[PDB]
């Protein structure tokens, strides 16, 4: 039994049995896995884009092609042998090794690591990307070379790795159907030499099946940290002492750019000038209103992430000059020049040859903010003369459609989170090598080619995130590109959803005083839910 | 531990540990002690004024001064001791002795009880009293004379009767200090004789500290059949799956009148048109509708409550003549001519010799929507000229208020509770004998005295309630009353909060299936809720 007061109720993002805590596979892996029990070189804060030091105690560029990481002083596994710079150079080389592994990319522009002692890491780079390894830093754990160094690919890969050796603030403690535990490794090195501790005594991973249930246990005050996606947020919080980051409107923070892929291969929208139109046509202010409840904000034209580091980089002449906004008298005067005409009364535009135009706007049946959104749009659309349906297919296909091209509008979130870099939102909407795939899984599902995003692509990549005038200026050249051909269509911010309640725990944060990105998922917690376990303190 | 699929889980009514199970005191003792352990003659339903054969066979005044009830056969306690005429004439003679018991006043006015039989029993009168004994028929528990026979006066008022012997449906099985465990009775007389049975092994009364717990636990599909009042009712039924009896508004029936009684005895609260003025000031529609989200009916000005079997004799050429309504000019019309002026320039009217007038409205102290009521209606009264303040005493100093009509104007619901008679109604207005007694428990607690009422009372107490055309002319008379003096302002109805969840058991009450009223306060299962027992499926 554990002590309701030492216990932390942690839930939303584990949706399936406990049954993976491989590092080598952190979003698969139970939630916490990795940040409780795998540590990163650094802590990373989306809020401001703040790294700070956690196994490394320094890390920077020494030349354009050097960077040197040192390690903190006395840190150990929890069987007691030293993490040292043998144990960060064997979970790069490891990918070399077994390419299957997630990072193994790293090694097509990383030339070697060397190890002068057993604090330093020295990385020598054939060719630096540097917004890439911005994003490695604090999303790769480092792993054991005494326990890995011997396993083979299936092994590394695939084992469930029960009771997983870590060098972090918790052990795994014990799991069945519904929940995962976590207890306090009492001889945490981190404890010795950063000064910090967690809070509880035990994390408990809480599964649900049901927005319900989730709901009800924060009400009977039985989850103290909720990533839960709860509709109803203004009553809840008017009448039901429920906390969220703002006290008003829009309630959470914002952690994806929601819009509009749309099919660059397909006519009409092949045509830019037509997702112009389609773009104008669109009012978000009913769907941030009527089916979110305001807790959700309406995105800028160029859909870059407030509360992010993506802003340090905002191009804010270009998207004044070039961005787009609902205007459905311009968009019916844009398709009249183009030639997209009403020729047989029935309301609808036909092509400039004649032929009837209806498309098909999807989101997964059952995602059913989404489906309102799109029956929103599909009347919007209408409005201008552009005969829309909206298509729910399950999830399996919307995401086959998504990998393939094969839609016509298609709403998405998928690599639009937050990061350390636009260059991910970038590299998201306009992936060249979609263009040469079958199946797309990292962006441009709509199959949008440009001449100079793909050499942008690679300038922003390997500029510093210190030399902000030019990573604006670059930011500046993609978002032009953006919002002249609009292959993707930014319409509204997904929500960071955070709901806590203080009868056991308190100090979370909000945004009087935002010290921590409130992010429970799988491999999230070293960017702010590690960092809030440090400064809970226990209720009256 | 109970399977949770043959246990029925209710909540609403039990706000202190379960402690006493005596049937003497049957508001006090646990909830479902009357009703499932102790049965009445009759079941009655608030819905339709029927009244259903339970001890009782039938029931019937073989003329104006003699009631005659036939028991069924069959019926017995559950240590199998026949269930006869003498206990129900030892549950009547036993108050005789014992004044004390809470219905010894009926010896004021009933004879003696014969039983020529062990099944009939012959209640002859000297003052037969119609609409008092229709209430009795229903809420006194019948209790078992073999047991009680020779117990002295404090065992009978006070003694705790753990493991309660009756002749009901269930037995008393287990307790703590958060619930209440009731077991069916499998060899229950009624399932042999009346051919029903409780769906439920097991009827649990749940008791929670607050509504957020209770909310909680409907969520968490832990709570079947809730009497919690719960606001919130709109976007819990939109988005969580939680019905009400109505689909829309008002989403509950309606169980009490909620009104102002005034301070007859105080001026200028002494004079009926100021009285009228202050009704007329009143709109109830922003308290209806920004207090309460819909959740309850505005009253009509008798304030006879809907769904209830007051409206069948409801005098509507009466209230159509009399009735008042929100008309703030006429009510400064009204108090112009009264001498009521504003003599100081504050915009605040004096008195006819120019003092200052500012009244105290008041309910208890957190109450929260009754204070929200009060400010409503105390910026409303300001409109039209006359200053008054919200008082929020403790619920202690409230009630003692109340008794001793020691307030201006004062928020009450207090006996305006759905009844089979709207003789509880006037009564609770208009109880004469509040002007000779220190305190008034019963009612007309603002001490307005007419010559006319308690002559109109006394004779529609000795009406018979089959006398429509009677009834109906006297409830006109004294809504005339009413209607013309203003005592006590109606306003709008409370709701009988009702929320239910269909995850182990279905098929409950609604509006589309009106079958039982849905109370399980203590002492009010016989009026529905054990009828929703006896007729719950469970779920699949
Ligand atoms: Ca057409
Ligand atoms: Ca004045």
Redesign the pocket.
């Known amino acids: 039994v554990l002590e309701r007061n030492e216990t932390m109720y942690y839930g939303g993002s584990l949706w399936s049995p406990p049954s993976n805590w491989n590092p080598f596979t952190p979003w698969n892996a139970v939630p916490g896995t990795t940040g409780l029990v795998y540590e990163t070189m650094f802590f990373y804060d989306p809020l401001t884009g703040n790294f700070d030091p956690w196994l490394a105690e320094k890390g920077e560029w020494l030349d354009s092609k050097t960077y040197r990481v040192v390690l903190r002083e006395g840190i150990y596994w929890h069987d007691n042998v030293p993490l040292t710079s043998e144990d960060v150079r064997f979970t790069f080389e490891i990918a070399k090794k077994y390419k299957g592994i997630h990072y193994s990319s790293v090694w097509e522009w990383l030339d070697h690591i060397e190890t002068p002692d057993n604090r330093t890491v020295i990385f020598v780079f054939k060719d630096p990307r540097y917004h890439e390894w911005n994003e490695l830093l604090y999303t790769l754990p480092i792993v054991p070379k005494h326990i890995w160094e011997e396993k083979d690919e299936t092994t590394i890969l695939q084992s469930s790795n029960e009771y997983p050796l870590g060098s972090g603030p918790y052990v795994a403690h014990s799991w069945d159907q519904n929940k995962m535990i976590f207890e306090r490794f009492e001889n945490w090195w981190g404890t010795k030499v950063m000064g910090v501790k967690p809070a509880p005594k035990y994390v408990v991973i809480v599964r649900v099946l049901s927005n319900n249930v989730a709901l009800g246990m924060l009400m009977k005050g039985e989850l103290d940290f909720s990533n839960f996606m709860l509709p109803g947020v203004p009553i809840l919080k008017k009448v039901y002492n429920l906390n969220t980051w703002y006290d008003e409107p829009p309630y959470h923070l914002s952690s994806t750019v929601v819009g509009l892929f749309l099919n660059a291969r397909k006519y009409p929208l092949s045509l830019p000038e037509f997702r112009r139109a389609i773009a104008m046509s669109i009012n978000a202010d009913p769907i941030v209103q009527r089916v979110y409840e305001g807790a959700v904000l309406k995105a800028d034209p160029l859909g870059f992430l407030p509360n992010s580091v993506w802003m340090k980089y905002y191009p804010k002449e270009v998207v004044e000059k070039h961005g787009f906004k609902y205007d459905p008298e311009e968009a019916k005067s844009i398709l009249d020049k183009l030639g997209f005409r ?9 092509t400039p040859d004649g032929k ?1 135009i209806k498309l098909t706007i999807e989101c997964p049946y059952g995602w059913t903010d989404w489906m309102q959104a799109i029956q929103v749009i599909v009347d919007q659309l209408k409005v201008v003369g552009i005969n829309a349906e909206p298509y729910f297919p399950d999830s399996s296909k919307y995401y086959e459609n998504m990998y393939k091209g094969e839609f016509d509008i298609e709403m998405n979130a998928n690599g639009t989170g937050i990061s350390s870099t636009p260059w991910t939102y970038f590299n998201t909407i306009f992936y060249p090598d979609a263009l040469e795939s079958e199946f797309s899984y990292t962006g441009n599902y709509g199959r949008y080619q440009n001449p100079e995003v793909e050499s942008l692509l690679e300038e922003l990549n390997r500029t510093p995130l210190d030399n902000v005038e030019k990573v604006t200026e670059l930011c500046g050249k993609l978002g032009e590109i953006l919002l002249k051909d609009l292959p993707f269509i930014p319409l509204w911010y997904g929500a960071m959803a955070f709901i806590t309640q203080d009868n056991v725990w308190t100090n979370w944060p909000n945004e009087h005083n935002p010290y921590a990105w409130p992010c429970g998922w799988a491999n999230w917690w070293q960017t702010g839910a590690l960092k809030i376990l440090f400064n809970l303190k226990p209720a009256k």
């Open positions: 009403d020729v047989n009364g029935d309301g609808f535009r036909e009837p």
